[PDB]
Design a protein around this ligand. Structure first.
Ligand SMILES: C[C@]12CC[C@H](OS(N)(=O)=O)CC1=CC[C@@H]1[C@@H]2CC[C@]2(C)C(=O)CC[C@@H]12
Ligand SMILES: [Zn+2]
Length: 257
């Protein structure tokens, strides 16, 4: 029922999901001059060597690549986190044009897209239990700008024609998400929420400062996806981003000076 359109988009979500107006909603604008360098923050530990990708899916609001999260094979630790978080899936948010698409903003700058790697805290045993906890999930966010191609994204790009419409899926084995990461793991962090319904306030956000570059041809393939199901009126899957929400009583911390 919810979506990104005039009649069902972000300004409507609070009717079905009243936490949309909560105290720790995401995304936010990252004011780089106000973010506090925290010398107590640890380097982020990203251990993706044993990742097992399974499927690629058009879920009607994004596409996602899903991983085997039945063991500690692709995990996030350290940084602001206590304990071990298993990679469940990654997905993107993007625009109709290159000047919008990201969910987080940096000094009000919007990037062309934003990559989210979604992880859940193994102390809660499954992701459904983790979304009911304030420290249940850790989402690693990476900005995309348009310039040079990202070679590690091309395998994703090339299968999108097979999942054009909602609920369509394909095998997507042996994909290495290390090929989507920038050089630096410098980050901002704050407590927030899922950025789609149910908008649960369960996420430690970790947003990398360094964007990756993707080519215009790569992001144009994102924009050929459809929000609609097969045979329904064709509505390009573009502008699937929630805008920045009020920071309220939160501090954004920087891992770097
Ligand atoms: C897929 C989605 C929503 C979109 C979120 O995107 S974002 N942008 O916040 O990372 C990532 C995310 C995490 C947990 C997942 C939830 C939808 C509902 C699920 C499946 C449950 O019922 C239990 C786990 C829940
Ligand atoms: Zn997301």
């Amino acid at each position: 029922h919810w979506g990104y359109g005039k009649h069902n988009g972000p300004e409507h979500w609070h009717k079905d999901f009243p936490i949309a107006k909560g105290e720790r909603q995401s995304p936010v604008d990252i004011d780089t001059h106000t973010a506090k360098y925290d010398p107590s923050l640890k380097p982020l530990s990203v251990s993706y060597d044993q990742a097992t990708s399974l499927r690629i899916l058009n879920n009607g609001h994004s596409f996602q690549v899903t991983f085997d999260d039945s063991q500690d094979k692709a995990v996030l630790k350290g940084g602001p986190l206590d304990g071990t978080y298993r990679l469940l899936q990654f997905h993107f948010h993007w625009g109709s044009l290159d000047g919008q698409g990201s969910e987080h903003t940096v000094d009000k700058k919007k990037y062309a897209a934003e990559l989210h790697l979604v992880h859940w805290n193994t102390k809660y045993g499954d992701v459904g239990k983790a979304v009911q906890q304030p420290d249940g999930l850790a989402v690693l966010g990476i900005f995309l700008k348009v310039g040079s191609a990202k070679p590690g994204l091309q395998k994703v790009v090339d299968v999108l024609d097979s999942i054009k419409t909602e609920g369509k899926s394909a095998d997507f084995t042996n994909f290495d998400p290390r090929g989507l990461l920038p050089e630096s793991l410098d980050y901002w962090t704050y407590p927030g929420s899922l950025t789609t319904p149910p908008l649960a306030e369960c996420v430690t956000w970790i947003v990398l400062k360094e964007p990756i570059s993707v080519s215009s041809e790569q992001v144009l393939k994102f924009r050929k996806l459809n929000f609609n199901g097969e045979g329904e009126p064709e509505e390009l899957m573009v502008d699937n981003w929630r805008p920045a929400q009020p920071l309220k009583n939160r501090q954004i911390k920087a891992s770097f000076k």
